[model samples]
Target: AYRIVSETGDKITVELTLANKNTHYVWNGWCFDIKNITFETTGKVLSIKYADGGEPVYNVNGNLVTIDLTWRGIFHLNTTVKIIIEIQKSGDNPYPHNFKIHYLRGESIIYPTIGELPASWKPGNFTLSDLIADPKSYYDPHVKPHQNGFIMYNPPHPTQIIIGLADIDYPLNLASSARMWVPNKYFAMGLALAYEWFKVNPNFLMALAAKENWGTAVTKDPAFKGYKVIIDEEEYYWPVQIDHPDGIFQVESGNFNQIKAYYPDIFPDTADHDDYMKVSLDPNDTAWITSPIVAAVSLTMERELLYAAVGDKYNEFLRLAKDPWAETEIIDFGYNRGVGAIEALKIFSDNWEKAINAEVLWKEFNMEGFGGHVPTVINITATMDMETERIYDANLTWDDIEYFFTVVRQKFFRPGAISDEEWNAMMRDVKRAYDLLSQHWGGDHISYRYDFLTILRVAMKHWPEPHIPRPTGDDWYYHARNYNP
Candidate 1:
């Protein structure tokens, strides 16, 4: 255990006590980082001599300070070690910082500063605009998955364990550190929270969405509802199998063609449950896997105050009962963590009218029939280097317009950043593109023979000079000419 013994204007003192005595163990020391605040001094901040006539080792590197005991095999049980540190702020600006100390033997400690950190300017209440402006700031900093920072237990080597969905003590090799397997839905939920809390960039969000499941809004698979397994080369399953088989092939255990039966009891005994062998996902209900993402996009729409053709699709997912943890957790836990994101978005959108009353614009767009074509365009324009002469089918132009319009609708039009007339003009052009599209393919069959080229060509006229020419001027035109009417 540790506690702050004393705190002065320029100094902080901490006292640490070890509860258990170990004859062979030696105490290493303590080190901590001062987040967002740098020390005035570059090197050692303070020094102290132990009661045993030995000096403690200390050093200050950047914002991190470390301290060590000089003597080895020192007694620590029930004995307190007092550490005093001297801190200096950068300037007159008040420090909004905290301390995190990592010890060699025990858990880390984060001691809050005595006084409240100065609060920055923020909206009095949550608004869709404010939420969209910065969503990351409001998110839980502790739960970052994309960076692979969240830690989880990795089984030693090719072994299976019957750990409950949320079990903390799932088997793992003590020597290795592992990252948790976070589902796509959690990221979606986090993105939603990030939109309201961090105000992350839409481009970055779309890029992330692309990396994870290609930005598809709905999940393709149903949730796992049950399971069975074979242990010791004998057919068995949960609640019935006496022993856990640590090593077994997962496919053989839970094959769709294999004859299967459920355990007498649905739940397993935590104390003596079989190691998970095979599991079954519910086929009856389609797991609303990426459901929460609609909340994220819904919040984006409400924040951006831009209407588009995909609004119907967005509503389809949002209206379905959303579960942030959808298929991840065994118990819903009142759907608080991920589920609450939807409610938060709802509140944000509800306040949108009062906060920003710009006229709503209808931007008709569709990419239904052109499934894979739009994604290819996104990749070619954003990731690929289309330098030389190249051409695409004219039918692909409709796909490109839908893709370009969707991206701009999300990226452009920030509150107070774009004026009403400029927004109206963009909307007007979008309306024009839709009219042209309807004229060309009004409830009729389509072709790759330039039917959609005119709509895209007219739509491109509305856009400001290409911020960055995607495929180069002559090349894009060369490609456009293939389908030019």
Candidate 2:
């Protein structure tokens, strides 16, 4: 029901008086002396009716209805209020949000049930408690850590190594940070390489390709070959969406222990939950260190266990660029600079962003990798000699490109790279790369006058702190200037 007040403090009520009557209802409640009056209904008001004279007509006859009677009520009216009501067979209900799925590893696993929601859901707007009977039923009932809004249990605590693992570019300043989970493919590859005899298995090969695809150094002209074939079958429904319902790619690696062994020095100050490289073999004993051999052995065990456990699910994350995300660029004004700088940064950011979006294409074409996924780390450089006299800021110089690369990497980083030396070699080998790019790729105007040490300062000055954080002032060092221009 709705109401409208009039000039003399009079009012009228318009209820959903008629569900299907010639519901001639007065809408005059709206005209209650306000500047612009409006009435909102909960559900869809199907048949609208308003009439000019007598009792306003409604329902079947759709027209604006006004009433003669002035509704009386207590009022300290400023502009006066108005009301309008409607009769509808249906009202708008909250769109059914199929409650969020919370997946926690170990005891936190949210097991899927027939017709029930998770236990954590409650009554209002479906809390966690409303779905399941007990808290234990809800995965990660204890609630560990969340990344990109997804609850992750037993995830590696955030550390410098974790940051580097997350970013393809180790020294990246503006790139997106990957979650704590080190992808499984490459780790498996490390294991497969550790035990070459096992490479005959299809699953083993899968781990290899994924690792080579996105591991630190991708072999562009890999010694081995892989093919991309399409299957002609109509037995697919929303293939891309269906493939990764539990996020992208499942990994089972034989290098978990190796990673743990190499982790302490890299990320010594990381929080517990964000640091996944830590060992859990002795759940009761948190202070054990495995030698390289022991670590390798444990890594193999972890991989075998995961492969055996996940079974079919392991393939789910390996297909195409099985990433599940929709990234929208949000501007950080503090990071913004003037027009020219902002525009420049945007170009770099936009290109990289497009790269990430490319994942959709891989998935759409059903490019489940036949090999392990590889991650790529790209470094871009443009020179300054005061010749261009361009000012670079976060919006223009580093961050933009960093953003672009990060986005693109998310989509294609898994494709891997040929290593820093190899990529640079490619650039040098290609005549156009040098001719077209060399002129404007390094140092500012003053750099031409200074020697190696000066160039080092500028290079290091412009470089962002590695995500793991590094020394500053006199402590930091640069060698780019040591190389001949």
Candidate 3:
């Protein structure tokens, strides 16, 4: 398998794993080996070598080069070899005309940088957001299903297997990268510690942590039961409103019982700690040290757990080509909302009655809406989409995901985004749900629909204020409406 370690203005680095070969079905060991590699470099070969010190005959014919590794002697079970090649620049299309890596096991004739590179960014294996969340995005498409399979044998940190493309991509230039923010001071080291726990984008992890809370206060106000409260207009400690804070990561707060189950020493579920008020998230009182670590790990568990759960379900129901935007959004949804509520959304497609009556339905806080239609609106909208548009059987789209979250769900769906009948149904559902929301809150005022997507759009940026959209207009909504697949 091969991966682009770095993609920059002048050079593109691809690491070809040469497996040392020796294993069985029960257990396995791995290294890297390549019979040869053939490709055309628009610029030229700037660097090529076996990182483990093995040298090969590097043949170059102008822009075309053939790297033959057969001369590097015998491969063994105890040995592992690595080959990194730095190929040259790009054209208007921004990709090598041809790419191939002939492996001993098999030949992978694949394009490492297949897509038309985004003009505003660097040409790494992943876009900034993609690289931050998906470890697999760092690898070439050929290695997808098992990109993280390196862990199967004796392994090292997941970051070791993946490239730190951020260092090369954005940090190198101000205009391209959206560096994750964290109160300025803890930026580097906090991102560092977070990555050790989470191999995916440590930068993005820091983004969510900062996006969610600053860990500005983790110390509990005894009077408020661990939640922050104000006296004399001074905000007191812990939980933006329950984190015992990733600065109040809230992972520990919500997963308090789960943490207690396996981590008795961390947050015990004694009566004193019953409501998460006494739970010490920052036991060390060092926001930088403890907060993001758990948040990153919790985010990791959440991102991957849902990746595993929703991916299969989504594909089983509505198979479609991968949409990175939808994938990341769904992962973020689960990360923020947790699987309980996210999974609760599933029941609606199959059984709307049970879904509407479920207690989780009331969590939307729209109960203050249209005479209590709030409790049932989400299920109704989701079920109608499934029945009318077959959305559940369609791939995950941010537009569909936004339906339950938007106050004016139908107003948001642009004309031509859906058929007249579909739009009419959606409009009908919005009126129905909102009317119910009004009833539940016991009046005419609609309390909340959360509009979560846009809130998160600014919240989870890579930089202080770059890369992600700062929508003052209907741009994202327009795109969401027109999105295909």
Candidate 4:
């Protein structure tokens, strides 16, 4: 399905013979984007990888290059591929891909499912260069046969992107961390803010705002604009993705940015980042911390569980402690993970199984997380820095926990971190998100829970350890349940 054999100047050398035919016609993968013409820089392909496995996920970003290819199937002859190939592209960096068969112009072959081909390359009778000058390379069950041909691909598509919860900005790109899950109006916006009482409901405060931000990547005020309102009549839009250090509920601009900029009329907040806090609230005009009406985000979750259960008399213990951490999902598990994940799920909900299986008697495990600060969970300081220190490594290594797990595996170094069968398909997908809507029938179920919401991604909060055998069982941490939004 491909072949260039050399580009040089920086490196390119491609050469595929990729197969595929009786597809019944299937696809679900293959993106290429790839650019880089002017003054050129996008080279990188010193013979792509997946070494013996059959590489694909390329990037570069220099002049763009993207790639993706989640195993875009290719092996279906003799019923398992002796050879097949098809009608796809032609020029400008062809097949690493070029799919530009234009007339009515640019027809995007972006492939979520672009099969059943042939407006060009055909072979219903068979003359594919006499089976590619004799390419009998074979292997099945799905794969195994890389170095000189016959490799497969297909299972690894579900890339993640379901965003919908509103009040709206998930039209895409809260800087795309594969668009981590949202789709719940979270009980119509947490019952429009717990109907302003105190009894932590609305799916435990949007499962702590989908673990703080992913409830709909928000934080706004860049001239904010969106309005479709209809609610029960159906057609709302909600947030739009902002995160100006949104402790709008995430809170920690180094512990409330000087008590939210010296009580800008009782915590308006801004400027301070040892982990968020940049707020900018308003009431009668242009309000936002991820909009939808003046937020203290539900009396800041009963004042962060009344300041973690009566500390400094947090305002006479916030209305005499309305069930102060008596488990309103442990005030959303210590308001966005930390009252020490509510003191280790209150020591495994007060004594359950030997301090949550002390790693079966501690030996080795490192998904890494200690208390944030690795250029705030991945920038790797403008592309590679951490030799160790700027904090949060907690002894990581499959190339520093895949350099915070994924930026295309931090471009090589022990490239293979997320496996253990991809951490048991992500802790069996958050314990099936506790029975995710009893099989929503014909609708939703797992679009973007990005490997346990990118290690509890609180608007990019993630410390050092995000999970590596940590997210224990019993539904990973959510108790006294009932709420369901």
Candidate 5:
């Protein structure tokens, strides 16, 4: 028998030795088992080990050796528990499983910082997004089946996770991070209440509240559905889940302040200066108290919106990428992490569908057409690459169109960034680009096909305004051989 100890805040090591006294099997072979270990508040075993039985089993050589073991996790404050390891011979096993073990469990006094470290704390466990919405990029397909229900555990890379459906044409070409925009003023009050609930009872559960024809919204524990007093010395009401704004009376409206004023306890105590800094909401700043929650919830809502709006179109992008027959332009890195294609079409499609559906219910009703805007195509170009021998052109008359479809989708991707200026530019470029492409192509291709990709490209970058929009230049039979009728 042996003792184990923790040298670092996050790691523990124990040693087990094979004993000869009170041995179970007469044979000279041995096997081992370990039991009964304790860890921190949320700590779980990180690894395993083997220890000797009360009596040791030996080989013909009779060599003595210690078993090595390592454990991982944040352990709780001081705890005492017995540990037992059993060793038996190769033939018959007869050692008790829980007899000779002693271990002292204690919580870590300090945990290393996970970055700049925010004022609030969430348990060190995977959240819903971490569990379900992982980007398909992390794992290699050859090793395991994606269908077995595996998703990325980490957030998408900063570059790619920006606002927009993966299927939206050329989403990142704008050189902007639209996807990151969060309307901090909206729903701030509700989220602030939820945070307060979380502090008092860390286990406040979150479950799917609604799963109707519209979509699903997450609900927190109903235990919080009551009146809470805020620093403003007012009582505000809350729902089982923090309530989102009703139409007209949106989350950003002044109505939310009443809600915030009610939940005083939700703010930091301002007394426990140590834990207060760690656990408090924006204690000094009333605005900060509610805003961060809004940002988080908005991002969450955005995912649902993407799934609803364009989930179906993503598969189209994938087909074009995978099948040369689709004749879609292929990029070197198309929607996959590590510059690889793991998310493929399914992920994009699903996200878009979710986003679209969510908007129809949550936001679309608030405004006409959701007022989504697109980018302005400053110019268009048609070019023949001599080396690759590929001819590129557009189909839509790129001139004078108010806005492009890609730009409209961009609005959905990053609602916060779509200012009046962006809205105007999106319309301008979309129209101009379409006009140029249309004249160049001139009835040579399908109305929608070429238009779809061209529209998508608007979200990507400025290309030379194509002189010829169609695949082949000639509209009259003699003018171009490749032009059909």
Candidate 6:
């Protein structure tokens, strides 16, 4: 139960008193979503004060704030707390705002089980102990809380890549050094692609995607505070949030082994977890080298494993995919390509599930990375100016794209896989992709034009009769490869 204590001008105060209505036994804290305002202790007499042992801590993003109060004493049967919060309009005027408050007894309020209260936060009141006992029973048991309130042990680590804004025309004074994780989109692409090949449920793909693009926060914690250093003989300082070893997307020693295998030269031998300290965030480094490859390999492996393993539980998997916390995105460029391929194959289902999955894989390959260059089949260039001279062509040679094309040809566009209408629709995207490549030819990477044309020609020639055949395998590389304007 809750009550309003007092109101004056823009300020309002309230007291929330909750008793252990659950008859049996109970433990824990009261959690609430507070917003548009901040609360401080009022130096007044009351049963509980803000600074008492039962300190009220909080997490916030924009207007969404979660204030958590851990009960000061043993939270057993019929326990009660009358929490007084003095609130006011954050600033200016009080147009409108939303406030969600709840009293939750233990475990973590965010991750709770059903039949607790409101019966929706989690499926069951299962804890870490329960999952450790029966790991095979559910996919969620793998998730456990970590320090600084992070969760772990499922799907995989989020894909960390460097994103530079200087090259994009929208230049910034300091290039974003904060390692950014692929924000929901890339994993969605991976999940969709794998689901198509196996006809497995997208729910599993969704669950797996949940483990990706983990969350980060900006806070007053001295731990998240940023700093700076000199590089290349130039002195500079980074913001308080940029280089924390425990910061979002920051790689630690636990992940060093995996990174070291893929990028032995770049993932330094030092025990340090601070990315800014050990490895140079310059043009080279595993973030640039293996990002696209990591994306491609993840998609392929997920597809291969699920197609081979997930047997009869596919239906259950789908349900999980639709869960409120599935945390997967459906919109992506690769997903579109997959959809086109599915249509070509005449796979007549109301749900374009396979297309969605395939499109996600396609999306991953075309991400913008390597210092803002598009990490597609290869990183292309835009100019030969002196500033960009040192930026080398990507090491992900034609052999990689060759394998990609080969798979698309054999699996999606085999002889009778598509009708003329569907085939033509897919060709439109191929033409557009080819057109964009010419706009990016720069420096000594002219050979890219020739090699890419050769790859596309091979895929085009493999199409059935009445195909969009402008580049007749032999001459395709000559006329179609070069761009004048």
Number of the top candidate by TM-score?
A: 3
Model 4 over residues 1-485: C-alpha lDDT tens digits? 45555555434555444333333421111111111111112333333443245555545554344433333322222122111111123335433554221111112211122011123322223232312222232101122111100000111112111112322222222322211222332223222322221222222333333334433333232332433334344443334233345533355444343333212222222323422233232211122212221223323432333332333333332234332222223333334444444444433234323323433211111112233211111221111111111111011112322222332122111213334554445434323332331132222332121221222121112111221111111211121111111
Global fold similarity of model 3 (TM-score) = 0.27
Residue-level lDDT of model 1, residues 1-485, one tens digit each, is 44555656655444433223433222111111111112233323444334344556655566455454433213233334444443343444323234443212111211112111113312223223321223243221221112100011121111111111111121111211111122222232233222222232222333223222322211111231112433234332121111223111111222211111111011112211112221113211111112222223322222122112122323332233232211111111102122223233332245333212212100011121122322322232222111112211122233433543453344332233334565566555544434433443552322222223222233333434421111111221222222210
Q: Which TM-score value belongs to model 6?
A: 0.21
CA lDDT scores, all candidates in order: 0.26, 0.22, 0.35, 0.27, 0.23, 0.28
Tell me how candidate 6 scores on lDDT: 0.28
Candidate 1's displacement at residue 202, Å, is 4.4
Q: How far is candidate 1 from the true structure (C-alpha RMSD, Å)?
A: 27.1
lDDT of 5 by residue, 114-178 (tens): 11111231223313232112325212112211110001122122111111111112122222211
- Tens digits of lDDT, candidate 3, 2-74: 6778887677788876555554211111222334567776566667788878567778786677877654523
Clashes of 6: 14
Tens-digit lDDT track for model 2 on 1-485?
A: 23322212122224322121112211111111111122333333333333332333222212222221122111111222222333332334311112121111111212111122234432224321232234332222122221220111112221000111121222212222211112222232222222221111112222222232221121212232222212233111111111221111222232332333322212222212212323222322211111111222333322222222233332332232224321101111101111122233232234334434455422332222322011111111101101112111111123222332232222211111223543343323222212222233352211111111111221222222221111111101111111111
lDDT (C-alpha) at residue 311 in model 4: 36
- TM-score of each candidate structure, all chains considered together: 0.20, 0.16, 0.27, 0.20, 0.18, 0.21
lDDT of 6 by residue, 196-230 (tens): 22222222222122112111111122333343444
- Between candidates 1 and 4, which one is better according to lDDT? 4
Weakest 10 consecutive residues of candidate 5 by summed lDDT: 376-385
Candidate 6 or 5, higher lDDT: 6
Candidate 2: where are CA atoms >4 Å away?
1-13, 16-82, 85-168, 174-323, 328-485
Candidate whose lDDT is highest: 3
- Once fitted onto the true fold, the runs of candidate 6 whose alpha carbons sit more than 4 angstroms away are 1-278, 291-309, 324-485
